[PDB]
Design a protein around this ligand. Structure first.
Ligand SMILES: [Zn+2]
Length: 396
């Protein structure tokens, strides 16, 4: 048993207890194409899909799992049992994230963060951007385009290179102009990293719910188009990484720089407001202009006057911006999960471990590895790779 529903009747965020072999149905289990042969995918929530495959799709130069802190294994995730376990493990982590107040906030923000309809060359016309959709095949074999915000997919060649990436635009920088774009997270629930810590020094494992939450925090930044340019770095660790980690690491971003960033994205949100105001037409949908305007009023928390004209309210912008950049941090998830974690963004080890968080005897939504009323409950024993060695196989 997987313990996917420790309380209540049904999972609170993931919409179905999927099995990889469940039949396709064109709605929440479907063969899909990314904008290649279709892959079987699972819609775990409004705007969120899971592709339990190694990622040989998003990047054309990374279309092979051949090897050239990394770990390679071209056979991982090639069989149906593994894809089923992947799906259930990702499902379990979403529920673990959603069982905390902070995670319900972050995932709500993610779901509301629809990529902006900024794809038209006519600045009075709202139009989707094609690369913020997937093509979903129905049972009868037709396609329909579906907008989405987030795809979780298996890693490419380097199994432990987890990241949040997205398709770019010829001219627009969608992750930094407030528009946002569909985010693809390369991630595996089946491996984790070791760090050392003294409570002799101990050899502990990172809780994969923390790692997933980290990538989801990036996704939130990028869905609201407020990511920091990857060329801002401390010599390399990017400001974007420091901000996502949070804690004292974030305090190192000089605070005058932060105000400059905040004013920049405030102005970008104002540009979005006046695009919505100058909009006269909409293409590629049966939904009215006014309705899609309101989707984006809702996303960016725009104010609307009696005339129907949108604007950015300074207090609402600061609230949203602060949530996405200061409240949603790895360090804050560590505090909510009450797990052990590296204390600064660089202090990870070269150690990699195979794990299996699906069986509830190994890992639970409420306690992670540190199972209550067991010897793993105290001193983070469940994450200690020597004490709880039955849950960690060392690979490198
Ligand atoms: Zn990161």
């Amino acid at each position: 048993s997987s313990g996917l529903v420790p309380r209540g009747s049904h999972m609170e965020f993931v919409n179905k207890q999927f099995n990889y072999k469940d039949p396709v149905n064109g709605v929440d289990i479907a063969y899909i194409k990314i904008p290649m042969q279709p892959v079987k995918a699972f819609k775990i929530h409004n705007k969120i899909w899971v592709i339990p495959e190694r990622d040989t799709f998003t990047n054309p130069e990374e279309g092979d799992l051949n090897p050239p802190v990394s770990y390679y294994d071209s056979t991982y995730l090639s069989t149906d049992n593994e894809k089923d376990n992947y799906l259930k493990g990702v499902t379990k982590l979403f529920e673990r994230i959603y069982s905390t107040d902070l995670g319900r906030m972050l995932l709500t923000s993610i779901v509301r963060g629809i990529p902006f309809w900024g794809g038209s060359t006519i600045d009075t016309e709202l139009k989707v951007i094609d690369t913020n959709c997937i093509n979903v095949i129905q049972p009868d074999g037709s396609y329909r385009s579906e907008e989405l915000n987030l795809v979780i997919i298996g890693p490419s060649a380097d199994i432990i290179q987890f990241e949040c990436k997205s398709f770019g635009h010829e001219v627009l920088n969608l992750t930094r102009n407030g528009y946002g774009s569909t985010q693809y997270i390369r991630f595996s629930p089946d491996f984790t990293f070791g760090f050392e810590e003294s409570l002799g020094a101990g050899k502990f494992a990172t809780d994969p719910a923390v790692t997933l939450a980290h990538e989801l925090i990036h996704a939130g930044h990028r869905l609201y188009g407020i990511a920091i340019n990857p060329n801002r770095v401390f010599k390399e660790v990017s400001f974007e990484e420091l901000r996502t980690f949070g804690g004292h690491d974030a305090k190192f971003i000089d605070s005058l720089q932060e105000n400059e960033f905040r004013l920049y994205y405030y102005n970008k949100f104002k540009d979005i407001a006046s695009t919505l105001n100058k909009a006269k037409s909409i293409v590629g949908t049966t939904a009215s202009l006014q309705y899609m305007k309101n989707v984006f009023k809702e996303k960016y928390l725009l104010s609307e006057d009696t005339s129907g004209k949108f604007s950015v309210d300074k207090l609402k912008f600061d609230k949203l911006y602060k949530m996405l950049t200061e409240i949603y941090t790895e360090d804050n998830f560590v505090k909510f999960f009450k797990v052990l974690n590296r204390k600064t963004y660089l202090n990870f080890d070269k150690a990699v471990f195979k794990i299996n968080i699906v069986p509830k005897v190994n890992y639970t939504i409420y306690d992670g590895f540190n199972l209550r009323n067991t010897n793993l409950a105290a001193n983070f024993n469940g994450q200690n790779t020597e004490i709880n060695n039955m849950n960690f196989t060392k690979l490198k």
